[PDB]
Amino acid sequence: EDLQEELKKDVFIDSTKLQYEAANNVMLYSKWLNKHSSIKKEMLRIEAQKKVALKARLDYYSGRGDGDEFSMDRYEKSEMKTVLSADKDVLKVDTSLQYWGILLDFCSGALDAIKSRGFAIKHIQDMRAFEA
Amino acid sequence: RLEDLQEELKKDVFIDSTKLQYEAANNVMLYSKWLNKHSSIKKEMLRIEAQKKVALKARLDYYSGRGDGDEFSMDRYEKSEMKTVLSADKDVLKVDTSLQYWGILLDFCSGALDAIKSRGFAIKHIQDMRAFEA
Amino acid sequence: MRLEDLQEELKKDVFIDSTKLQYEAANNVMLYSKWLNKHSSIKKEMLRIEAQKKVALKARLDYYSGRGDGDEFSMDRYEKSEMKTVLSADKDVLKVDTSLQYWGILLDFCSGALDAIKSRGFAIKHIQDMRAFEA
Amino acid sequence: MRLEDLQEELKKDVFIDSTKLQYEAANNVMLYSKWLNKHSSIKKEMLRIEAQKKVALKARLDYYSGRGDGDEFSMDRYEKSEMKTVLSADKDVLKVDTSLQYWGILLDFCSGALDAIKSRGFAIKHIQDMRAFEA
Amino acid sequence: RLEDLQEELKKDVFIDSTKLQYEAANNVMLYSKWLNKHSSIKKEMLRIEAQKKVALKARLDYYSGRGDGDEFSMDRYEKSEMKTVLSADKDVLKVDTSLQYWGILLDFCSGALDAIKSRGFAIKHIQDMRAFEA
Amino acid sequence: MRLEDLQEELKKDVFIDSTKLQYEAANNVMLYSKWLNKHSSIKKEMLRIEAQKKVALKARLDYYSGRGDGDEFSMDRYEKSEMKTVLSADKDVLKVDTSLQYWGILLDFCSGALDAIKSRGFAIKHIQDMRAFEA
Amino acid sequence: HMRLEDLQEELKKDVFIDSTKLQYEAANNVMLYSKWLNKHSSIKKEMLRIEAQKKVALKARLDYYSGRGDGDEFSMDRYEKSEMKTVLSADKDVLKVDTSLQYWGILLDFCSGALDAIKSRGFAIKHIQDMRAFEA
Secondary structure (H helix, E strand, C coil): CHHHHHHHHHHCCCHHHHHHHHHHHHHHHHHHHHHHHHHHHHHHHHHHHHHHHHHHHHHHHHHHCCCCCCCCCCCCHHHHHHHHHHCHHHHHHHHHHHHHHHHHHHHHHHHHHHHHHHHHHHHHHHHHHCCC | CHHHHHHHHHHHHCCCHHHHHHHHHHHHHHHHHHHHHHHHHHHHHHHHHHHHHHHHHHHHHHHHCCCCCCCCCCCCCCHHHHHHHHHHCHHHHHHHHHHHHHHHHHHHHHHHHHHHHHHHHHHHHHHHHHHHHC | CCHHHHHHHHHHHHCCCHHHHHHHHHHHHHHHHHHHHHHHHHHHHHHHHHHHHHHHHHHHHHHHHCCCCCCCCCCCCCCHHHHHHHHHHCHHHHHHHHHHHHHHHHHHHHHHHHHHHHHHHHHHHHHHHHHHHHC | CCHHHHHHHHHHHHCCCCCCHHHHHHHHHHHHHHHHHHHHHHHHHHHHHHHHHHHHHHHHHHHHHCCCCCCCCCCCCCCHHHHHHHHHHCHHHHHHHHHHHHHHHHHHHHHHHHHHHHHHHHHHHHHHHHHHHHC | CHHHHHHHHHHHHCCCHHHHHHHHHHHHHHHHHHHHHHHHHHHHHHHHHHHHHHHHHHHHHHHHCCCCCCCCCCCCCCHHHHHHHHHCCHHHHHHHHHHHHHHHHHHHHHHHHHHHHHHHHHHHHHHHHHHHHC | CCHHHHHHHHHHHHCCCHHHHHHHHHHHHHHHHHHHHHHHHHHHHHHHHHHHHHHHHHHHHHHHHHHCCCCCCCCCCCCHHHHHHHHHCCHHHHHHHHHHHHHHHHHHHHHHHHHHHHHHHHHHHHHHHHHHHHC | CCCHHHHHHHHHHHHCCCHHHHHHHHHHHHHHHHHHHHHHHHHHHHHHHHHHHHHHHHHHHHHHHHCCCCCCCCCCCCCCHHHHHHHHHCCHHHHHHHHHHHHHHHHHHHHHHHHHHHHHHHHHHHHHHHHHHHHC
C-alpha cells in the first residue's frame, strides 16, 4: 500500500519546474530501482527457505520423519503435491514469498511509469513550444 | 555489496545544471563504467555456474547411491523426490544462493544502464528549455 | 582476448576531445566500425568452439549412456533422466561450455560498446547545441 | 566472401573527407545502397544453404533412426531423446550448418554497416553545423 | 530477380548536385515507385503463402499415413520426426523457397525506402553547403 | 479497392507542380486527409473480415475436432499437433484469411502513402528555400 | 455516439487553409489541436469502459465454456484448454464487445493521425507566410 501511495505522488508533475523534473525523473528511477533490487535479494532469501521446508516436510510425510513426528496417512505420490501445499509450515513461506512477488511486480510498473513521465515532460516542452 | 552499487548509482544520476556540457560528455563515461561492472559480474557468475554444476552432480552421486567420496545416503530417495532433495541440499543451496546474489547485482546494473541512457536524454531536455528562454 | 583489456580499450574510445568536435564526429564512425569489427570476430571464434562443444557433447553422451567414447566406458550406469545433470558437470563439456560462454560475454560486451558509441554520436551533437545557445 | 575483408571494406567506407563534405553527404547514400546490396545477396545464399541443411537433417534423421541413409545404417540405437545431440554433431549436418551460420556472422555485420552509414550521414550533417558556426 | 532491384536502386540513389530542386521533388516520387514494388511483392507472397499452407497438409497426409494421391509412406514417421521430414520434402521446399525468395526481395524494397528517406535528407544537407559559400 | 488503383492514385498525388509551389504546399495537408480516410476505412473493413474469420476458425475446428460442423464430421481423425496445419489449409478459412491478409496490404500501402506525403511537405519547403537562395 | 465519416469530414474541414487569413489560420490552428486532443482523450474514456466489460465478459464466458459457470446456461461440448483461446474469440458476446472495442481504437487512431496533421499544419502555414518574402 505504501508502494502504490509512493508512486502515485511521484508521477504527478510540477509544470513550473520542468527543467528540474526532467532531472529528478532519473532520480526517481534510481529510487525505485533501489527498492526493486533489495526485494529480489529478499525474495532470494525467502525462496531459499522455501527449498528447505518442502524437503523437511517431504521427509515427514514419506515416513522419514521430521522431529518426533511421522505421518500415518501414508500419502501416495498422487497425493503429495496437495499435501505439501496445504501444509501449515510450507504455506507460511509461500505466502510471504508470493507477497514479495507482488511487491516486486509493482516496481516493474513504476519503472514503466517513470520512463514515460520523463517522456511526458519533454512532450510538455514540445506541446507548449508550439504556441511560441 | 548491493549497498555499494545502489548508492553509487544514486550519486551518478544527479545532474549539475550549471555544468550541463560536462555532464553530457561525462554521461557516456558513466555508461562505460557500469558496462565494466556488468561484464565483470557475469564473469563471476560463470565461474560460480561451473561450481554449481559440479556441486549438483557430486551431491547427486551421494544421494543416488553412487556415493560422494566415502559417503552414501540411507534415505533411499526416489526420482520423483529428487528435485526437492538437491534443491534443499546444504552444498547446492550455498552456491545457488551465492550464484543468484551476483545475478541480482547483475540485474541492478541493467537498470542503471536504462537510467544512464535516459539521463543523457534528460540533459538535452534541460538544454532545450533553456534555449527556449531565448 | 581478455575482458578487462577490452574494457580498458572501450574506456579510452568514449572519451571526447571537445577541442576537436568536428574530428570526434568523424572519429565516432571509425570507433563504430572497430567495435562492429570486434563483435563479428568474436562470433567467428564462438562458432568454432560451439562446433567443438557439439562434438564433445555427443562423445560424452555416448560415453555415459554406455556406447563408449574411445577405448573408455563409464561404469556408473546413469539413466536418461540423470544425463542432463551429469553432462553439464562433465570435464570436457564444462571446460568448453565455460569457454563458449566466456566469449559470449565479450560478445555481449561489444554490443554494449556499440550502444555506447552509437549514442556517443548524439552526445557529441548535444555539446555543439549548447554552444550555439551561448551565442 | 570473407568476414575480415568486409570489415576493411567498411573501414574505408566509414572514412569521412573533411575537404569534400558535399560529395561525402551525397556518396553516403551510395554506401547504404551498396551495403544494402551485400546484405540482400547474403540472404539469398543463406536460402540456398538452409535448404541443403534441412535435407542433410532429414537424411541424417533417417540414418540414426534406423532407416539407413544411402548404403549406410546406424548401429548405435539412439533413442528419441538422444537424437538432437547426435544430429548436431553429425559431420554431414555440422558442415552445412557451420557454413550457414558463418553467413549469419556476415549478415549481421552488414546490418551494422547500414547502421554506421545511416548515422555517418548525420556525422556528415554534424560537421556542417560545426562549420557554419565556425564561419 | 534480386539483381534487377539492386542495379535499379543504385541508379536511383545517385544525386545530381546541379539540379537539386528537381531531385528534392523526385525523391518523393521514387518512394512511390519502390512503395509500388514493395506492396505488389506482398501481393505475390500472399498467393504463395496460400500455396505453401495447402502443400504442408497434402504432404502431412502422405507422411501421416492418410495418403497424398495414390501414395503412402512406409517410413512410419513419429511426431518428433515430422517438422524435419516435411521441411526436407521436395514439394514443401519448392514453394517455401519461392516464398523466401520473395521475402528476400521484400526486405530489399524496404531497404530502398530507408535509402530514399535519407536521400531526401542529404539533398537538403547539400543545399546548405551551397549556401555555405554564400 | 484494388492495390493497383492505390499505386496509380498515389503516383499522381506525390507529383509536385513546380510552377504552383504556393498551392502544392497548402494542398499537401489536404492529401494527408484523403489517405487518412482510406487508412481508417480500410481498418473498418478488416475489422469486419477478422470477425468473419474468428467465426470460421471455430466452425471448421469443430468439424475437424469431431464436434462436427453441420451434418459433417472429419474421418481423418486429426490430432492437436496436426490441427494448425489442417485449419490453415482449410478451404473456407483459407478464403477468408486471404481476404483479411489482402486488405492488410492495402492498409500498409496507405501507411507508406502517409510516409510519402508527410515528407513531400518537407520537399516543398526545400525547393522554395533553394529558390529563395537563388533569389 | 461517433461515426468515422464525421471525424473524417470534421478533420477535412479543419485542416483546409485560408491563405488570405494566414495570421488568423495560425491562431485558428491551435484551436483545432486542443479540440482533437480533447477527442483523443474522450475516446479513451469509452474504451477503458468497454475494455472493462470485455475483461469481465471474457472471464464470464471462460467460466461458462470451462464448466465453472453457474446460471441457466452450461457448456456441454467439453472444450479443452488448448481450444479455449480459439473458441472464446468466436463467442457472440465477446466478438461484439471486441468488435466494439476495436472500433473505438480506430477512431482513436484517427485522432492521432488528425493531431499529426494539425500539429504540423501550423508549420505549413508558417512556410507560406515565409514564401512571400521570396516574392518580396
